Amino acid sequence: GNKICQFKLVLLGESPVGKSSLVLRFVKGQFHEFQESTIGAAFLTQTVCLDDTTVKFEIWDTAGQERYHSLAPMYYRGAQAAIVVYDITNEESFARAKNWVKELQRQASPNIVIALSGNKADLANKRAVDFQEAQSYADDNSLLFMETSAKTSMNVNEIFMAIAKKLP
């Protein structure tokens, strides 16, 4: 196809659930066991082929530490989509993700597409968040849910592509 589309996507979530790792896996096909904490935000881009359209992702990888909370709107304000990430081995991170979803639903663009990533799915032997419970929460709140693993690549390309498919 000869069509070209572009959209802004922001990743939000508690530190250190794997936001930067998810982006690095999608954009560079890499995974680093040792990743420095993000400061403020980092920016990356990736262009993919979706059917007959060349979609360009402008990705804002936010720092998740609490001290950066007041900067979040600078990154989500003009976003067309968001991925709120939690760590499946940490229930508190899942509760934090729900509060990020509430903030987006109240202060981001009314038509933002929101996805929920249950990351570090490769650590299911240490699961703290039930898959079905998270799916139910996502369904009730109109969120695109997938468990992912930046470490193995599980569902990483899939979650980004599913978001792109749901954009106008």
Ligand X SMILES: Nc1nc2c(ncn2[C@@H]2O[C@H](COP(=O)(O)OP(=O)(O)OP(=O)(O)O)[C@@H](O)[C@H]2O)c(=O)[nH]1
Residues that bind ligand X (CB under 6 A): 13, 15-21, 32-33, 35, 37-38, 63-65, 119-120, 122-123, 149-151
- Residue 88 CA to residue 86 CA, distance in Å, equals 6
Give the nearer residue to ligand X in terms of CB position, either 123 or 167: 123
Decide whether 26 or 55 has the Cβ nearer to ligand X. Answer: 26
The CB-side HSE value for 92 (13 A sphere, CA atoms) comes to 3
Shortest Cβ distance from residue 13 to ligand X (Å)?
6
Q: How far is the CB of 27 from Mg ion (least distance, A)?
A: 13
Give the three-state DSSP class for 156. Answer: helix
Compare residues 35 and 157 and give the one whose CB is closer to Mg ion.
Answer: 35
Dihedral, 35, 137, 97, 70 alpha carbons, nearest 10: 140
Residue with Cβ nearer Mg ion (42 or 167): 42
CB of 114 to Mg ion, least distance (A): 19
151 touches which of Mg ion, ligand X, none (CB within 5 to 8 A by kind)?
ligand X
Q: Which of the listed partners (ligand X, Mg ion, none) does 118 bind, with a CB threshold of 5 to 8 Å by partner kind?
A: none
Q: Which does residue 88 bind out of Mg ion, ligand X, none, counting CB within 5 to 8 angstroms by kind? A: none
Q: Is 84 helix (H, G, I), strand (E, B) or coil?
A: strand
- For binding to Mg ion (CB under 5 A), which residues are involved? 19-20, 38
Contact of 59 with 11, CB cutoff 8 Å: yes
Work out the angle between the directed axes of helices 156-166 and 19-28 (0-180°, nearest 10). Answer: 80
**Distant-in-sequence, close-in-space partners of 66: CB < 8 Å, separation ≥ 6:** none
